């Protein structure tokens, strides 16, 4: 459930959301649209399949994995879009024509949206334009994204998450830098405060020679998860391919 | 249509990095100096220079 840097959040500015889009496909002859966001869908808190809810990233310095329901996600390009299906990392929906696509979660009054530009154009199949597939007509060859959840258009590669620094972990007191890990989590830290230094602290620990809070970094070793090869994360030292997951909704 | 995949970036943010040579299609790599990049804390580095 990584969170990354959307170019357009709710208000005006680029900022970090769990539901950034990064890429979009629009080649299905029906106009069905497949979207990839950093969030997940159809999985419960531990990751086990549960259609009615989804899990995503937390806006806190503990930065755990939080959850919500399907009834409060919305897709819209020019008007609201009708969701057709969802599978973990991926969404698919029908959208009206427009210039950009927006995914929005409405956790009550907590609105978090990402928008990305994509000139989606009403397309058709045949030698004549038409608004809708007519009741009567010839049956010709077309290609539409398969609504089935368990299809596969390909695979995407996932890797161990890299370092993810924080500042609540760090603190400045009387010109000395201390670390404040959360409860029971072995948090690795490093810096040069003069000479270089590294280790892991699970409790509030002091640092020597450290005069400024900006001098050091601390973060917990969360190797129990795999993250997409997103361009808005600093990867781990070893970026070996460690997981592949299917790209649902194969263009059948 | 090519899909342009951009791997996750890397920082050796007070050492030195070199762009190696890969075998990927139209592979491109480059190195930058002082960047001091922020992601969600507001600092991911020591030695801002």
């Amino acid at each position, epitope marked *: 459930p990584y969170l990354g840097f959307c170019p357009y959040c709710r208000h005006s500015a680029p900022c970090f959301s769990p539901i950034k889009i990064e890429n979009v496909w629009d080649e299905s002859d029906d106009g069905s649209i497949r979207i990839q966001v950093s969030a997940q869908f159809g999985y419960n808190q531990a990751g086990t399949a549960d259609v009615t809810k989804f899990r995503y990233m937390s806006f806190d310095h503990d930065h755990d994995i939080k959850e919500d329901s399907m009834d409060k996600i919305a897709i819209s390009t020019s008007g609201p879009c009708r969701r057709l299906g969802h599978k973990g990392y991926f969404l698919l929906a029908q959208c009206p024509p427009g210039d950009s696509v927006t995914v929005s979660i409405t956790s009550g009054a907590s609105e978090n949206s990402c928008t990305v530009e994509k000139k989606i154009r009403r397309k058709f199949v045949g030698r004549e334009e038409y608004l809708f597939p007519p009741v009567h007509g010839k049956l010709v060859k077309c290609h539409v994204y398969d609504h089935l959840k368990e299809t596969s258009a390909g695979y995407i590669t996932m890797h161990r998450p890299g370092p993810h620094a924080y500042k609540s972990y760090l603190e400045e007191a009387s010109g000395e830098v201390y670390i404040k890990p959360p409860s029971g989590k072995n948090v*690795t*830290y490093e810096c*040069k405060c003069g*000479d*270089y*230094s*590294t*280790g*892991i*602290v*699970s*409790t509030r*620990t*002091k*640092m*020597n020679g450290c005069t400024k809070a900006k001098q050091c970094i601390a973060y917990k070793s969360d190797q129990t998860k795999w993250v997409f090869n997103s361009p808005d994360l600093i990867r781990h030292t070893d970026h070996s391919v460690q997981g592949k997951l299917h790209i649902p909704f194969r263009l059948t | 249509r090519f899909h342009t995949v951009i791997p996750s970036p890397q920082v*050796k943010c007070c*050492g*030195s990095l070199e762009c190696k040579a890969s075998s990927k299609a139209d592979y491109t790599c480059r190195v930058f100096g002082g960047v001091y990049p922020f992601m969600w804390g507001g600092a991911q580095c020591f030695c801002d220079s």
Partner: antibody, heavy 130, light 112 residues
Framework: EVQLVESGGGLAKPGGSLRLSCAAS????????MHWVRQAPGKGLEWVSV???????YYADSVKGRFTISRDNSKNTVSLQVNSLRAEDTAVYYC????????????????????????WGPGVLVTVSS | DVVMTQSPLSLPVTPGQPASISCRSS???????????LSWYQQKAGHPPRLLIY???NRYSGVPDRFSGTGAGTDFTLTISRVETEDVGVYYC?????????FGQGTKVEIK
């Protein structure tokens, strides 16, 4: 002041086991690789094992499968569990702190591989006899 | 494993005169930084070894100036310029640039 106290040694039977502890003070304990070295009576010392600040553990060849070094940074200690005791394990064991844990170059800054041991504890005697 | 050899095994000395301890490695001990990981320690009877020299030429703090370290490659020497009575004890060279760390067998320095 930097200080290392060793404890847990004494008399033991061959084939037995014992846990040694080294409590450290006066410096950032989590920031350094801790070493166990040994010197049995009348011989030179003998490096036994090291645990990095990243919990990476290396051992001498003579101590494989029997000695396990561990560490807790919260209470500032490094321990050595010893199993399958034998006669030549009889020695004074010294808990040792490197003055420097690594150095930095243009390719980055590196871990455990050291240049010198700056601090030694008083050491604790282990005597394996029948 | 790096083999470290010291000579002489016994070095009777006289106060007021210089003395030297010679040290050979089976391998080079230079790092990528160019610093060489050789260190000289003194051990007194009933006491843990105390660092004298690190980075063959650099003297540790509080060490008397009469101690000095020289050498390169695999050949190294510790020189006492003016032996004192407290200087008796067992002197060891050790290295840390190669795993496992290796130390010289040691030289006993005693007053003639």
């Amino acid at each position: 002041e930097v200080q290392l106290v060793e404890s847990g040694g004494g008399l033991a039977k061959p084939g037995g086991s014992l846990r040694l502890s080294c409590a450290a003070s006066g410096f950032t304990f989590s920031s350094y690789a801790m070493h166990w070295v040994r010197q049995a009576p009348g011989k030179g010392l003998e490096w036994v094992s090291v645990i990095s600040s990243h919990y990476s553990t290396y051992y001498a060849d003579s101590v494989k499968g029997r000695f396990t070094i561990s560490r807790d940074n919260s209470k500032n200690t490094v321990s050595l569990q010893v199993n399958s005791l034998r006669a030549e394990d009889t020695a004074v064991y010294y808990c040792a702190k490197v003055g420097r844990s690594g150095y930095c170059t243009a390719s980055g800054c590196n871990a455990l591989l050291f240049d010198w041991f700056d601090v030694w504890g008083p050491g604790v005697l282990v005597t394996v006899s029948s | 494993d790096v083999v470290m050899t010291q000579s002489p095994l016994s070095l009777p000395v006289t106060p007021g005169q210089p003395a030297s301890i010679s040290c050979r490695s089976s391998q080079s001990l230079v790092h990528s930084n160019g610093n060489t990981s050789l260190s000289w320690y003194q051990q007194k009877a009933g006491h843990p070894p105390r660092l004298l020299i690190y980075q063959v030429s650099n003297r540790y703090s509080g060490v008397p100036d009469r101690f000095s370290g020289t050498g390169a490659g695999t050949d190294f020497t510790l020189t006492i310029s003016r032996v004192e009575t407290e200087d008796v004890g067992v002197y060891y060279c050790g290295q840390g640039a190669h795993l496992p760390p290796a130390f010289g067998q040691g030289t006993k320095v005693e007053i003639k």
